[PDB]
Design a protein around this ligand. Structure first.
Ligand code: A1EM3
Ligand code: A1EM3
Ligand code: A1EM3
Ligand code: A1EM3
Ligand code: A1EM2
Ligand code: A1EM2
Ligand code: A1EM1
Ligand code: A1EM1
Ligand code: 5YM
Ligand code: 5YM
Ligand code: A1EQ8
Ligand code: A1EQ8
Ligand code: A1EQ8
Ligand code: A1EQ8
Ligand code: 1DO
Ligand code: 1DO
Ligand code: 1DO
Ligand code: 1DO
Ligand code: 1DO
Ligand code: 1DO
Ligand code: 1DO
Ligand code: 1DO
Lengths: 254, 195, 254, 196
């Protein structure tokens, strides 16, 4: 109420609403049709759930700082966004490793060890997301003072550095996974891989790099200006991974 | 993946009709449209049984005499015996259980009119691209991987594990004209090289 | 008035001496016998050269800041050490890539494309080492007094962060490569792979992590305590990659 | 890599002597120590030419009548014709150019005394491990990959591309006794199972 929202917050609430709508549609399609139960669809549904959580968290956070004054709710909803982004970046790695193993294990991928593997990967993704989105609501918080707040106010500075380190470790794995998929494929199938990897790098590098070169005393505009592309990465994930499928399109034209 | 400098029509000397006639004479069957299936034999991954059932269904038709089938593969001895029995029953069917060299495979691709790929799951589909590079019209299941490669203008698409639809597609392809076949071969070559 | 050496400076000087001795031995062995000209031996020789440069740089830097008083000679040697460490890590990555491709490209590895690939890898490794080891000279150093000096005095904070980002990307690539080597091999082989990767990680994560959590005002002791294991890694590389070969050993016994 | 369960002697009911005798009768050769080579034919990667040259050199020896050879592979038609000519010339040589199912390979490994792997280069060596898992004593070139797997107590080592040395190694292995052969087979099984 009192804080008098600023022109850079509405632009983020509307992005949250758009992401929420897109991924709600995708999740409804996946859950409604009982034929979509292969590991590919489980992973692509986990991705959609993560990006729906991120969007709803953005909307609720904007509605809890400028309409319902409450510090507790804002602190709780920052952890939800951290968990949503961590899970949304883990689901991409799970999808890519599934793609590579299906292209490689052409005859072993269709056994019953591809379901145990998928369950293990989902557990790892949604356990890491909760372990690394449990810190704001836990010791590593900067609310009490004397803990050197990071570029995002409630979060600490060690927590954000750990998140950036994990992202750069996981970014390197994707480079090798795509370098292995290129050999199997390899002109029009390399351009698509390049575009899909560029849409991820160009969207997530800005924040994770400013996260290490920034400080609590930096201008507040850079956080908005580098965290907007990260939000827009959850708007193109459904298009790349869900709406480009042909069964999903068939179910959608009804 | 696909070697564009290994799979080409340049390495073949004679014309398409001449190579087809020579191969058919070597196999001891008369001139006609020939359909080739190459792959492993098994229950539910490559679906040779689907092709065999389709051939059995077509046997009762009058036009079956105009079709030639070459089946190459290995696996369950029961399926091998079934294919051998089908070969014995009909003179327009041949089975090759031996392993063939890449040169023979390319010659076959450049000789046979149509390549059948009725697999239940083909994540990538090397066989389709290799057959297309030499100008062979495919008839493949509409599963992931094969659907991306084969468009409506470069072949046929059939539902997986539906022998009736496979037989219908074979019958429909039996009536394509020579000019349409040449156009389809050119389109297939362009699509295969584009990737 | 030359500064008085401390205990840690003497420790680093002797470590540099030992590293120089070991890697000089390895380089002499490889360059002596004309039978060692396969790509593996080229990559191992590059690794040995990088480690020898690092050790000689350590010795000279100690001798250039405490005996030959000089402020312009102790700045070039920091760049030399940065180049040596970057080239050492690049050579490790190249060796791992070559091993993986030899285990995978079983029949196509023995061709001319392998030689061309090895030359490309060497060019990339040393070009990157020189590009990321010329920044201390002019592009980025805190000597002027307005560039937010980093944990290592002559270097800058913006340069020591790019170095860490690159290291974490390379570490992820190494994890993926070792995953595909484990799949091909698979408990002696897995145990050896785990030991060889654990040595590298345990030696290089301390510095690269303290490099992001440290300021210019932190105690100077943490520099030496995190930068000593890197020298130890440069010390144990020849044992893992050179002296464990069964062709180098016969020449050693000669 | 190695299943460690697909390959095992338990899947074969017959004993070593009975299985070997049945396999030799199927190929129409009398009982005796048999050496098997499996792999593609090519100029300088798998090395069937060295084995064929060693066989030709040994042919002039009296003990060559005590050795049986099974050669499985495909490739250059010239080498195939050479192997066929050797098979025709001598009754103790057989060639199988056709492809074989994994069950047939498993049965072979458990029947033939020695498996020859004279490869010029072999980074990993699946063939050696698969043969050892079924108690087959290998005779492999001392190149990378095969050197690690095979020690002094688990087989023989020979210089790469040296027909004379390969023939000498075959002749030396000809004198190994039955008890020593059983001990070597057990050691090979242990090494293959433990090694990953
Ligand atoms: C073949 C038929 C398959 C039947 C269905 C299998 C379920 C697999 C999971 C579906 C995808 C998914 O989004 O998971 C979200 C939940 C959490 O969502 P949260 O509410 O946003 O956050 C709370 C954090 N948990 O996460 C998980 O899946 C947890 C991992 C469980 C995987 C193993 C399930 C065991 C089944 C035997
Ligand atoms: C391939 C990508 C690799 C990713 C590499 C990064 C791993 C991170 C390892 C340790 C850091 C960490 O997780 O924080 C500790 C948490 C935080 O708790 P607290 O605030 O310190 O509590 C103190 C209370 N006074 O500890 C936990 O909560 C335990 C969960 C650890 C989560 C790691 C899961 C990783 C699975 C992949
Ligand atoms: C197979 C036949 C044998 C041919 C042998 C020549 C091939 C190249 C071998 C280089 C190996 C090496 O140890 O690199 C050290 C130098 C750098 O040492 P610096 O003095 O400490 O640092 C100065 C920075 N350059 O490596 C290089 O310079 C990399 C050269 C890249 C080009 C590859 C060779 C091109 C020749 C055709
Ligand atoms: C595979 C994972 C590893 C990936 C490596 C990512 C790092 C790439 C970023 C290079 C940017 C940089 O720091 O350049 C520094 C100098 C410039 O310093 P200046 O601008 O002159 O300072 C101010 C001057 N007044 O760059 C150069 O000099 C140009 C060479 C860039 C070298 C990058 C080679 C990477 C090859 C792998
Ligand atoms: C999700 C997590 C495991 O991702 C990774 C983590 C590390 Cl430390 C290294 C690598 C990867 C992804 N590469 C990978 C994973 C798996 C896999 C098998 C079983 C369960 C889960 C994953 N198998 C694979 N085969 C070839 N790459 N590869
Ligand atoms: C040194 C540098 C190239 O290392 C990498 C860099 C990136 Cl961005 C991604 C990956 C890798 C290493 N993985 C890799 C490299 C090459 C390769 C081919 C030609 C020249 C040089 C290297 N081929 C491969 N095949 C399967 N992985 N793989
Ligand atoms: C302080 C200044 C920092 C500013 C940083 C700004 C960086 C710019 C980021 C821009 C965000 C958008 C990047 C998306 C690119 C992907 C194209 C669309 C792909 C979807 C169709 C693919 C279909 C076939 O695959
Ligand atoms: C306040 C700062 C504190 C941080 C201090 C961190 C210290 C971490 C210890 C790091 C030094 C230990 C290095 C381990 C190497 C182990 C492997 C040995 C391999 C030998 C060859 C085997 C050959 C078969 O392959
Ligand atoms: C197998 C495990 C997978 C782990 C992958 C790790 C990726 C984590 C990287 C990056 C995660 C970045 C998290 C965003 C920071 C918080 C954004 C925010 O707080 N916005 C507040 C609204 O103002
Ligand atoms: C294909 C490209 C490969 C690039 C890999 C990048 C790895 C770089 C990582 C790490 C490099 C760390 C460099 C050490 C910092 C300087 C140490 C120092 O200055 N000591 C001064 C003495 O007091
Ligand atoms: C998948 C394999 C990964 C290998 C392990 C990665 C560990 C590095 C991440 C940071 C560790 C955690 C860094 C320490 C926490 C920072 C604060 C401590 C000091 C308090 O004053
Ligand atoms: C393939 C597509 C890649 C596109 C992205 C390239 C990398 C962007 C770098 C972000 C720079 C991030 C800029 C940081 C701004 C300065 C912060 C200093 C604050 C001091 O207090
Ligand atoms: C290996 C290929 C994958 C793609 C790698 C992309 C590059 C990422 C690192 C960017 C570091 C870029 C950091 C730039 C530092 C900017 C500071 C400017 C001055 C502040 O006042
Ligand atoms: C994976 C195999 C085992 C080896 C793993 C070792 C990893 C440990 C990371 C230590 C981080 C060490 C970072 C310590 C930071 C010190 C406090 C900074 C104070 C700033 O003023
Ligand atoms: C996806 C972004 C769409 C454009 C949103 C523009 C909103 C700007 C509002 C600034 C003034 C307050 O109403
Ligand atoms: C990629 C889409 C970007 C559109 C939103 C950019 C912001 C436009 C409105 C200006 C807000 C600053 O006052
Ligand atoms: C940092 C997390 C790495 C953990 C990897 C776990 C691998 C478990 C193997 C499960 C095997 C399923 O085939
Ligand atoms: C750095 C990217 C590394 C992978 C590029 C590979 C592209 C050419 C491979 C062609 C040969 C297919 O086996
Ligand atoms: C293998 C690692 C050897 C570490 C040696 C450290 C010895 C330091 C003793 C002197 C420290 C100054 O009080
Ligand atoms: C790498 C560890 C072996 C070197 C030990 C040297 C310790 C010297 C510390 C005492 C300083 C004497 O001036
Ligand atoms: C930043 C690193 C970029 C690596 C790209 C290297 C691709 C070159 C392929 C050369 C041909 C290999 O046979
Ligand atoms: C996260 C570590 C990933 C590597 C898993 C590989 C080891 C599991 C057994 C693989 C079975 C052989 O194909």
């Amino acid at each position: 109420p009192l804080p008098s929202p600023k022109a850079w917050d509405v632009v983020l609430c509307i992005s949250g609403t758009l992401v929420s709508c897109e991924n709600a549609l995708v999740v409804a399609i996946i859950v409604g049709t009982p034929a979509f139960r292969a590991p590919m669809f489980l992973l692509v549904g986990s991705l959609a759930v993560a990006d729906l959580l991120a969007g709803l968290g953005l909307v609720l956070h904007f509605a809890a700082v400028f309409c319902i004054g409450s510090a507790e709710m804002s602190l709780v909803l920052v952890g939800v966004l951290a968990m949503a982004f961590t899970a949304s970046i883990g689901s991409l790695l799970a999808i890519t490793v599934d793609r590579y193993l299906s292209l490689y294990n052409a005859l072993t991928y269709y056994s019953e060890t591809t379901v145990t593997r998928t369950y293990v990967m989902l557990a790892l993704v949604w356990g890491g997301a909760l372990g690394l989105g449990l810190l704001p609501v836990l010791a590593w918080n900067c609310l009490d003072g004397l803990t050197t707040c990071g570029v995002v106010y409630p979060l600490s500075k060690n927590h954000l550095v750990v998140l950036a380190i994990a992202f750069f470790m996981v970014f390197g794995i994707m480079l090798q996974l795509y370098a292995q998929i290129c050999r199997i494929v390899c002109r029009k199938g390399i351009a698509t891989l390049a575009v899909v990897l560029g849409a991820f790098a160009a969207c997530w590098l800005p924040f994770t790099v400013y996260c290490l070169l920034g400080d609590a005393h930096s201008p507040p505009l850079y956080t908005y200006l580098t965290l907007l592309p990260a939000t827009y990465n959850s708007m193109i994930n459904p298009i790349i991974y869900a709406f480009r499928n042909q069964d999903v399109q068939k179910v959608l034209w009804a | 993946g696909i070697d564009c400098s290994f799979w080409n029509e340049s390495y073949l000397t004679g014309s398409r009709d001449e190579r087809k006639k020579s191969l058919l004479s070597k196999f001891g069957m008369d001139e006609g449209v020939t359909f080739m299936f190459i792959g492993r034999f098994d229950r539910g991954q490559k679906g040779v049984d689907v092709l065999l059932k389709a051939i059995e269904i077509l046997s009762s038709k009058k036009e079956f005499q105009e079709m030639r089938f070459i089946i190459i593969g290995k696996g369950d001895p029961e399926l091998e015996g079934w294919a051998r029995s089908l070969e014995e029953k009909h003179g327009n069917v041949k089975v090759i259980t031996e392993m063939l060299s890449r040169e023979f495979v390319r010659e076959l691709y450049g000789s046979v009119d149509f390549v059948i790929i009725p697999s239940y799951f083909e994540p990538f589909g090397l066989v389709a691209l290799e057959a297309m590079c030499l100008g062979a019209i495919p008839i493949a299941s509409a599963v992931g991987g094969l659907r991306d490669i084969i468009t409506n203008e470069t072949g046929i698409l059939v539902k997986a594990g539906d022998p009736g639809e496979l037989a219908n597609a074979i019958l429909k392809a039996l009536e394509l004209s020579r000019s349409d076949l040449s156009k389809f071969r050119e389109n297939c070559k362009k699509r295969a090289m584009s990737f």
